[PDB]
Design brief:
Two copies of one chain form a homodimer. Chain A is an alpha/beta fold. Chain A has helices spanning 17-27, 42-49, 56-63, 82-87, 100-104, 119-127, and strands at residues 4-10, 33-40, 71-76, 92-95, 108-110. The first copy, chain A, has one domain. It is classed as transferase.
C-alpha cells in the first residue's frame, strides 16, 4: 500500500488528550501514512489568533513525544499554500472557508475535536474542592 | 540484540513534558526494550500519596498516546513485588529505600526528573499577566 503524506498544523498549546486524539485521527486517515505536524510561531499565533502560554520550543518538544507524529515543521507558515504542499509532497491536509481551495482540490480531510478535556477544564476541577462559602 | 522488559509505574496525573522525558529514558535504557507502564489506582494514590486530578481512565488514555509506551498495566499494584516481576517477565524497574531489594537484585535502573515543567508551573505563567496592583 502506497504511503500517504498527511499534514496537520496548529498551535498545540498545553497539549492535551484532545490534540492527541486529533493527531491519531489524521495519522489513521489511511493504512500507511506519514503524519507531518506544523507548529505555529509565537508571534503569528498571538497576532492572528490569541494568547499562547508555551513557547515554540516547548510546544514542539512536547509533540515529539506523541506516537502519531512522524515529522514536525516548526515553525510552520501561518497560511498553507499550494506551493507548501508541493515542497513537502503533502497529499492531504487534516483539519477539523480558508479550506475551500483544499476541498476544491480533493486534498482536505476532516478530523474532529472533543471538548471538556483541555488543560483549562482541569483547573476548574481542582478549584471545585473549594466551595463558595 | 535480546529484548529487555522495562517497567515504570506512577500516577501520571496531568501528563507533562517531565513524565514524557522520564518515559523516554526508561525506554532507551537498552537498545531493544518493551516499556511497560503501570498506572496507580485512584484510591491508593489518594490514600498513600495525595490529591489526584484525573481518573484512572483519563490518566491511562493519555499514556497510550506517548510514543515510548509499549504496554500499560492499569491499575498497577501500589507496591512492586518479586512475584509481580515474575508474572510480567520484567527485567528492570525504572525509577528516579523501598527500592533496596530491587537494587540488591540487580534489577533497578535510575531515571531522572526535570523540574519547572509541570502543569502547575504553567498556570503560574498565565497568572503573571495580572500584576499585583
Amino acid at each position: 500500500s502506497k504511503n500517504v503524506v498527511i499534514y496537520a498544523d496548529g498551535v498545540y498549546d498545553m497539549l492535551h488528550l484532545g490534540h492527541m486524539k486529533q493527531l491519531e485521527q489524521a495519522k489513521k486517515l489511511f493504512e500507511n501514512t506519514t503524519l507531518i505536524v506544523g507548529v505555529t510561531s509565537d508571534n503569528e499565533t498571538k497576532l492572528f489568533k490569541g494568547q499562547v502560554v508555551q513557547t515554540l520550543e516547548e510546544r514542539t518538544e512536547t509533540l515529539k513525544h506523541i506516537r502519531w507524529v512522524d515529522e514536525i515543521i516548526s515553525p510552520c507558515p501561518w497560511v498553507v499554500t499550494p506551493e507548501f504542499l508541493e515542497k513537502y509532497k503533502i497529499d492531504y491536509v487534516a483539519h477539523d472557508d480558508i479550506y475551500a481551495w483544499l476541498k476544491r482540490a480533493g486534498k482536505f480531510k476532516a478530523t474532529q475535536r472533543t471538548e471538556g478535556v483541555s488543560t483549562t477544564d482541569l483547573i476548574v476541577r481542582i478549584l471545585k474542592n473549594y466551595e463558595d462559602y
